[PDB]
Amino acid sequence: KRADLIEIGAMERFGKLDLPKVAFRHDQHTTAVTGMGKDCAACHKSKDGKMSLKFMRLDDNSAAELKEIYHANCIGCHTDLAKAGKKTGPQDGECRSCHNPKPSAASSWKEIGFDKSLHYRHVASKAIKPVGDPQKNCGACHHVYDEASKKLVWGKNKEDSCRACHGEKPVDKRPALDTAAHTACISCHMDVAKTKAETGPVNCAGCHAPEAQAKFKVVREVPRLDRGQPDAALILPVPGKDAPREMKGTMKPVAFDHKAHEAKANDCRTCHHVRIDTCTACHTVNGTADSKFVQLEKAMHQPDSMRSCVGCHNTRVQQPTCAGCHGFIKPTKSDAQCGVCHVAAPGFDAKQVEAGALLNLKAEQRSQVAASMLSARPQPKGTFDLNDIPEKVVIGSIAKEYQPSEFPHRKIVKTLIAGIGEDKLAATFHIEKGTLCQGCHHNSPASLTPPKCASCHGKPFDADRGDRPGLKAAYHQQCMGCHDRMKIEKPANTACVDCHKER
Numbered sequence: 001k002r003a004d005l006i007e008i009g010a011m012e013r014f015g016k017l018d019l020p021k022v023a024f025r026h027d028q029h030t031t032a033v034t035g036m037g038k039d040c041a042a043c044h045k046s047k048d049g050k051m052s053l054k055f056m057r058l059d060d061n062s063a064a065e066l067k068e069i070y071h072a073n074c075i076g077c078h079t080d081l082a083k084a085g086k087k088t089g090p091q092d093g094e095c096r097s098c099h100n101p102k103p104s105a106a107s108s109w110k111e112i113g114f115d116k117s118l119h120y121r122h123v124a125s126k127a128i129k130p131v132g133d134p135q136k137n138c139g140a141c142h143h144v145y146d147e148a149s150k151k152l153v154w155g156k157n158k159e160d161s162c163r164a165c166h167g168e169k170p171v172d173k174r175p176a177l178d179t180a181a182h183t184a185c186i187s188c189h190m191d192v193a194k195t196k197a198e199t200g201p202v203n204c205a206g207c208h209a210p211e212a213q214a215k216f217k218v219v220r221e222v223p224r225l226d227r228g229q230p231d232a233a234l235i236l237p238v239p240g241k242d243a244p245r246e247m248k249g250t251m252k253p254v255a256f257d258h259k260a261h262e263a264k265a266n267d268c269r270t271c272h273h274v275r276i277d278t279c280t281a282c283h284t285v286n287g288t289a290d291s292k293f294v295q296l297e298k299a300m301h302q303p304d305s306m307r308s309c310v311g312c313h314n315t316r317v318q319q320p321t322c323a324g325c326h327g328f329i330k331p332t333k334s335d336a337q338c339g340v341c342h343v344a345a346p347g348f349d350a351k352q353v354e355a356g357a358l359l360n361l362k363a364e365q366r367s368q369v370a371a372s373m374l375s376a377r378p379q380p381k382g383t384f385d386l387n388d389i390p391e392k393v394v395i396g397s398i399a400k401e402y403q404p405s406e407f408p409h410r411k412i413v414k415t416l417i418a419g420i421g422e423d424k425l426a427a428t429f430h431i432e433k434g435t436l437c438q439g440c441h442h443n444s445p446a447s448l449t450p451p452k453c454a455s456c457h458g459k460p461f462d463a464d465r466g467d468r469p470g471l472k473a474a475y476h477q478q479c480m481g482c483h484d485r486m487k488i489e490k491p492a493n494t495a496c497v498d499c500h501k502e503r
């Protein structure tokens with residue numbers, strides 16, 4: 001179980017290896033060289049104040065130069081160590097002990113990233129001094145390339161994840177993500193270490209061991225990370241540069257409570273999966289090569305993505321307090337439900353306006369329109385006064401093998417409501433007083449007087465073919481299914497008499 005394994009194979013670049021690649025355990029090496037009184041410089045060279053992540057060179061010049069670099073420096077240390085009686089590595093004649101095919105695995109490595117709590121601990125840190133702003137420390141970490149001064153500069157309000165510009169491999173001036181991260185994070189972690197203030201880790205396991213990550217202090221006291229995003233955004237059906245038509249849209253546009261969404265999410269990137277910007281710069285109505293022709297409709301409504309409005313919302317719906325109802329019902333895809341998001345802009349018919357004219361507005365003007373949209377929504381409707389519903393229901397129309405079932409209708413509804421508690425997805429998407437009722441009274445209008453299940457679930461007569469569930473099967477599927485999705489302990493589905501006593 002290691003998080004610090006590296007497979008050394010730089011040579012493959014120049015041709016097929018004669019021998020296996022060389023497993024190397026970096027934390028085993030660093031533990032040992034520190035104890036010998038040495039540091040990173042024992043194996044990495046520097047230039048311009050920057051440590052190279054490569055072993056004992058600035059460049060991969062030839063096959064022959066790397067092979068000599070490794071043997072001469074890797075072995076040389078193992079030799080001196082053995083000649084001194086210390087614990088050590090493979091010696092010069094031990095080819096297969098370095099060049100070893102077997103290491104199947106034993107890798108526990110894991111990606112690391114900044115959630116909002118870990119990003120705050122860096123901002124709020126006194127060892128990371130402000131720069132270019134009396135109060136702000138953003139420029140200690142974030143940059144953009146300034147063509148004018150031919151150099152990196154802190155772009156105020158242009159901060160983004162490193163992933164937005166640093167990818168899988170280098171793109172000539174900008175390093176790939178791993179070297180970016182390893183160069184910036186570790187080197188500051190080591191400066192701050194010299195002043196014995198609190199710091200971040202430098203051992204590989206320290207960032208990459210699952211156990212280490214679990215140990216990090218987490219903070220739910222997280223202030224708004226604030227570059228200059230809007231509180232209220234106006235999302236639009238964007239046609240895109242290359243579209244024969246330039247067609248408006250088909251729906252009304254959608255105001256979006258950006259500030260509230262921030263406070264509920266874990267970072268920015270979950271939504272802005274490529275870079276902070278609109279979504280429409282790439283996901284247009286018809287899609288674009290920048291999305292990979294993934295169209296705006298897929299981006300905003302896709303059922304199983306955490307990135308989309310519908311998709312993220314779908315995962316909140318699996319939480320037990322919700323899933324009783326949400327695992328049973330089907331969607332109406334009704335115009336009222338679409339209209340929870342697609343609303344009227346104040347003062348005009350957005351459908352008669354091209355995207356461009358709204359995108360071209362100044363951010364503060366567009367925010368004001370969305371805000372007005374947001375503010376005009378209908379207040380939460382709530383459900384019926386539970387006193388207008390039967391406190392108890394006895395279900396006995398097919399009683400036989402057992403007595404009829406006495407069921408605590410009203411108490412169960414209050415608990416559903418209590419479990420929903422303050423959740424705002426539910427308060428706004430539960431659009432009719434009887435919406436909650438439809439969690440069990442499916443397929444009929446929201447109402448104080450829903451019909452009985454028998455009104456349309458066959459009496460109990462077909463052992464073989466029966467269009468949707470007969471009566472008994474529908475009660476059992478509804479009652480027992482909710483109890484399991486909600487993790488209700490009692491009654492238990494095996495406890496027949498707890499829902500209907502015998503006789």
Ligand code: HEC
Pocket residue numbers: 141142143144145152159160161162163164165166173174175179180181183184185
């Ligand atoms: C997380 C906040 C980030 C880290 C850590 C780094 N970046 Fe960047 N970066 C960007 C460009 C265009 C370059 C090339 C600059 C040039 O033309 O010389 C870089 C370079 C780096 C480097 C190399 C430093 C060196 O002198 O060799 C490091 C270590 C690095 N970046 C770390 C651009 C961007 C960017 C575009 C918007 C973002 C979001 C980031 N970098 C984020 C991070």
Ligand code: HEC
Pocket residue numbers: 006008010024026029030033039040041042043044053054055178182183186202
């Ligand atoms: C002092 C504590 C350090 C720090 C901060 C780093 N190392 Fe090393 N390192 C060594 C070797 C053989 C490699 C593989 C590169 C190659 O073969 O050319 C590395 C690599 C790294 C990385 C990159 C990790 C990755 O796989 O992406 C990093 C971030 C790194 N080093 C930092 C060898 C050694 C040593 C030889 C005994 C010593 C000592 C160190 N490294 C020390 C450090």
Ligand code: HEC
Pocket residue numbers: 008009010011012016017018019020021022067070071074075078089090091092093094095096097098099
């Ligand atoms: C015992 C004498 C040998 C022999 C015959 C070879 N090695 Fe090594 N070697 C080491 C490392 C890290 C490399 C680079 C790995 C890579 O980038 O792929 C090498 C390289 C080689 C090569 C060239 C690559 C190839 O497979 O063609 C060859 C032919 C080679 N070695 C032969 C490291 C070590 C050791 C670490 C201490 C030890 C011991 C050895 N090598 C020993 C030998």
Ligand code: HEC
Pocket residue numbers: 003004005006026110111112113177178181182185186189200201202203204205206207208
């Ligand atoms: C000590 C030498 C190591 C070694 C061997 C590795 N890491 Fe790191 N690393 C860090 C971050 C932020 C990234 C970007 C990817 C991510 O977000 O987790 C990486 C990337 C790597 C890779 C590349 C994996 C890939 O397939 O893209 C590898 C092999 C890797 N690391 C190994 C963060 C850290 C640390 C934060 C302080 C430190 C310490 C390390 N890594 C150290 C090492």
Ligand code: HEC
Pocket residue numbers: 112113114115119122123128136137138139140141142159160161162163225226227267268269270276
């Ligand atoms: C000063 C207050 C700021 C502001 C306004 C921002 N940062 Fe950071 N930031 C840092 C790193 C390593 C990341 C990448 C995290 C990852 O991919 O795991 C970020 C990310 C951001 C974002 C996008 C947030 C996201 O969802 O990923 C934004 C909008 C942002 N930053 C703004 C690193 C640092 C620092 C290093 C110690 C510090 C200081 C800052 N950032 C400071 C700020």
Ligand code: HEC
Pocket residue numbers: 254255256257260261264265270271300306307308309310312313316340341422423424425428
């Ligand atoms: C795509 C851009 C959208 C749109 C149009 C909406 N969301 Fe979300 N949402 C999420 C969570 C956790 C909640 C409840 C928050 C709380 O309890 O305070 C919500 C709530 C809403 C609402 C109701 C409140 C409101 O702002 O009006 C609405 C109308 C709404 N959402 C619209 C979570 C997410 C996501 C998780 C990653 C993502 C993606 C989205 N929402 C995306 C969208």
Ligand code: HEC
Pocket residue numbers: 395396397398399400401402403404405472475476479480491492493494495496497499500
């Ligand atoms: C334990 C596994 C059992 C067994 C053997 C049965 N049930 Fe139930 N059942 C429930 C409800 C609300 C009804 C409708 C009652 C009515 O309209 O009279 C039923 C119906 C049945 C029947 C058919 C009716 C009859 O009496 O013949 C049978 C044979 C039956 N059940 C067997 C509800 C529940 C539960 C509530 C969640 C639980 C638990 C069970 N039943 C468990 C069992």
Ligand code: HEC
Pocket residue numbers: 383384386389390393395409412413416434436437438439440441447448449450451452453454455
């Ligand atoms: C939201 C406030 C409501 C309202 C207004 C009602 N219910 Fe229910 N209810 C449920 C079941 C399984 C039955 C028995 C149906 C049958 O046996 O055919 C009932 C019964 C009712 C009635 C009586 C209807 C009748 O004519 O007998 C009424 C007026 C009624 N309900 C209103 C189950 C549930 C739920 C399961 C968890 C939930 C939620 C609700 N009901 C919610 C509501």
Ligand code: HEC
Pocket residue numbers: 328330440441442443444451452453454455456457468469473474475477478
């Ligand atoms: C009284 C509350 C009930 C109960 C307990 C159930 N129904 Fe219905 N139902 C109806 C139709 C047309 C179907 C076919 C499937 C569908 O269209 O959703 C169903 C299906 C069910 C199931 C099975 C669901 C599954 O996902 O496999 C169950 C457990 C169930 N129902 C229970 C139609 C209606 C009504 C039409 C007006 C009425 C009223 C009810 N059902 C009432 C109830």
Ligand code: HEC
Pocket residue numbers: 022023024025028029032033042043055070073074075077078081087088089090097098
């Ligand atoms: C001293 C400066 C070292 C240099 C440079 C390299 N290695 Fe090493 N190595 C060193 C020590 C003190 C040890 C033993 C560590 C321990 O805790 O036992 C090692 C060990 C290895 C091993 C053996 C792996 C194992 O026993 O579990 C290998 C395969 C190894 N070293 C490879 C290796 C390579 C490939 C190096 C250059 C890349 C290298 N070592 C340099 C000390 C030093």
Ligand code: HEC
Pocket residue numbers: 112113121122125127128140141181184185186188189192198199200201207215216217
């Ligand atoms: C200075 C400019 C830093 C850079 C850039 C990065 N880190 Fe950092 N980190 C720094 C400090 C001063 C601290 C201690 C903060 C405190 O007061 O608690 C940290 C802490 C971390 C931690 C905490 C680990 C823990 O023990 O809980 C982690 C995991 C961490 N830093 C990771 C990290 C990464 C991945 C970075 C680049 C992507 C990075 N840090 C940059 C200082 C600085």
Ligand code: HEC
Pocket residue numbers: 235236237238249250251252253254285296297300301309310333334337338339340341342
């Ligand atoms: C939030 C949870 C949404 C719900 C529910 C629905 N839509 Fe949606 N849709 C949403 C956003 C943020 C967007 C992008 C903004 C815009 O108005 O363009 C969309 C976009 C569409 C589109 C494509 C553009 C257009 O045709 O106007 C379509 C066709 C669309 N929306 C249709 C649609 C329907 C039919 C819905 C109910 C069934 C519906 N959306 C719900 C966000 C949300």
Ligand code: HEC
Pocket residue numbers: 271272273274275277278279280281282283290291292294298299300302304305307308
């Ligand atoms: C280019 C700069 C984009 C921006 C801006 C946004 N998205 Fe994207 N998206 C992009 C690509 C290239 C892809 C496919 C490649 C990939 O990463 O999958 C996507 C895909 C999506 C999806 C579908 C996910 C799936 O499982 O296939 C969604 C739901 C999505 N994108 C949402 C989305 C949102 C909400 C954006 C603004 C916050 C956004 N994207 C911007 C490219 C780009």
Ligand code: HEC
Pocket residue numbers: 313316317321322323324325326329330331332333334337416417419420423425426429430435436437438439440
């Ligand atoms: C039964 C009592 C319910 C519980 C408990 C919760 N929801 Fe619900 N919800 C219910 C119904 C009958 C509907 C109507 C479905 C339709 O499409 O007409 C809904 C609707 C929603 C929706 C949006 C519609 C959808 O996209 O599925 C959302 C986003 C929603 N509800 C959220 C939500 C959450 C977060 C809940 C737990 C907190 C929750 N609902 C509970 C019935 C019931």
